[PDB]
Design a protein around this ligand. Sequence first.
Ligand SMILES: [Cl-]
Ligand SMILES: [Cl-]
Length: 162
Amino acid sequence: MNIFEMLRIDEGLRLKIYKDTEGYYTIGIGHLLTKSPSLNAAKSELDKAMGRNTNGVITKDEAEKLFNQDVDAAVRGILRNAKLKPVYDSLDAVRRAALINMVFQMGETGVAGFTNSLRMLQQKRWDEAAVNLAKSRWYNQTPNRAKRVITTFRTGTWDAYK
Ligand SMILES: [Cl-]
Ligand SMILES: [Cl-]
């Protein structure tokens, strides 16, 4: 299992514009287009992203291409972030994936706000962090997904995705 496979499970794959769990226009593999309520604004951003007139629809290949860029960006966001980097560096390979997932879903900023959990993860206090992570909007809004990531941090294994 790896980051790609993992996120692909959490996000799914859609070829037509859609609304995410928060009601934002998205496409592909969890690629957010825009927070605006306007579909046109969405279509616009999409075309700009694909370099072509999509008419709100892309191919698998294109989705995958977005997905690659989005993963890379996330890693890079982590690495450039002063609060994130050190955490990420302290972790093992599976757990890193877990950090990446959260960043992909919520943004480097969103993640950097779990200050307390971050600190616990850094100290390798697995059960405590799991508990702290759960006290969050994130967990309350997307419980199944949150559970999977959290188990991942807790165990350092892929069991939740098997
Ligand atoms: Cl983009
Ligand atoms: Cl969920």
